[PDB]
Amino acid sequence: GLPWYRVHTVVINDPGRLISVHLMHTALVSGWAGSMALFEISVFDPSDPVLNPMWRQGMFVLPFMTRLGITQSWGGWTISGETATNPGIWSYEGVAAAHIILSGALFLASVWHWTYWDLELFRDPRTGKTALDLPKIFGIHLFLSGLLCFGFGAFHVTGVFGPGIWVSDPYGLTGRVQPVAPSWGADGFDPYNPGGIASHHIAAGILGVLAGLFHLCVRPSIRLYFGLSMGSIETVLSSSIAAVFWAAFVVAGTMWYGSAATPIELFGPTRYQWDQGFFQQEIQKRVQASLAEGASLSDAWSRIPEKLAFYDYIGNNPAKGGLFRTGAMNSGDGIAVGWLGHASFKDQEGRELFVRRMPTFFETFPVLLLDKDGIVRADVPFRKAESKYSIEQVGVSVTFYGGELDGLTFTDPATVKKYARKAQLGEIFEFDRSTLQSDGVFRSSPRGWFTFGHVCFALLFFFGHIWHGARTIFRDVFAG
């Protein structure tokens, strides 16, 4: 009576049914791929691509489909926001339906392989017992793997035949799926260099093909074969688990730290961007330029794109979220409606006061207004018995340039303090928290969720490698 945690060990020595069980897993994965996509498409709003991006709508699979090219939809809408003139068979819905049909086909294939498990192919010719030439099996699979890798990078990514990959400006203000050209240089190893993807996939692909030929031709060393139990299926399983958990960590870091493969306008902005004021510096930069040109403060702030300002918001920060705060980013803060405009806080003396932005590590941060020198000149005191920086005594007035409150000045202590609290959270945008009944708490972006899930899987798979690997090394002792 196999224990519950040893029931799937029945096919360990049944190559015919091993394919079947693997076919099942592949079918389930394919089905979820199309199923989740169909669900997301059914719950996605493409009306506003600026203040309501996919990552704000909590979409997870949609970003990946868009990353490789899928942009139009049979709904007559493009992820760009324009009408899908001809979405074609490869519409978001089409690709989803394809995966679902593939799942079904895999299921029927699994049934056949399960029923007809006793195939002479699995049997070894010398003895007749079921035996798999793991050495060659890896070689043939590696050769095929290399082919696809090179083809994807030299065609789909390059664009010669494939549609292309999603590339965006450093500030993700403007980007789409355009054919890229392999860098083939030192810059090719820059994670934010899109060209690297094509160059790397082409290089890695050709090598993989050659490596596959080697494993197919050259046989394993006698000392290596026994030393690495190259005759054990669990041996490849343990080593394969090591590879998947290794990649998971690399993939997660790429998503968290950001890269050309993780567009900020497809997965949302990275936490480090806010920590370094990436978008904020740009906004102020162009503003200063417009002022240098001679435009009024309103003109400069009016020039600022709402999308750029939207990026400059603690809410879009992926780290600003909770483990059980489930739902789309739109829920918890509302659906962005518009930009109130830049808020300028000035004391009675006329000194310009800057509201210290909330550090990501801080769930709640005290409101502080500092001068250009960096000296606190005003704040909202917790104790008002004898304040020395009270917004009232300092007499701070907030004037909004550009946006909805363009040209609007506020001197009411309460009104100024309200905007000051928003200012510390970055650009002040209008949000509709009624349609979704937002709870008023920030949520994590799909970027953060993906990183958390894959890092967790990676850490667990480490135990899997040690477990299956230990069993292979101590097979004699574990034998029973």
């Binding site: 370094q276 510096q281 102020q284 002022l291 310009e352 210290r356 550090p359 500092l370 250009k372 960096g374």
Partner: peptide, 23 residues
């Protein structure tokens, strides 16, 4: 007015502009 840094720093002391060239 205030320099971008004279603005980014008071808003965010850990801003790259303020955290760079400081020597």
């Amino acid at each position: 007015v205030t320099l971008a840094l004279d603005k980014d720093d008071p808003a965010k002391e850990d801003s790259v502009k303020g955290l760079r060239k400081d020597i």
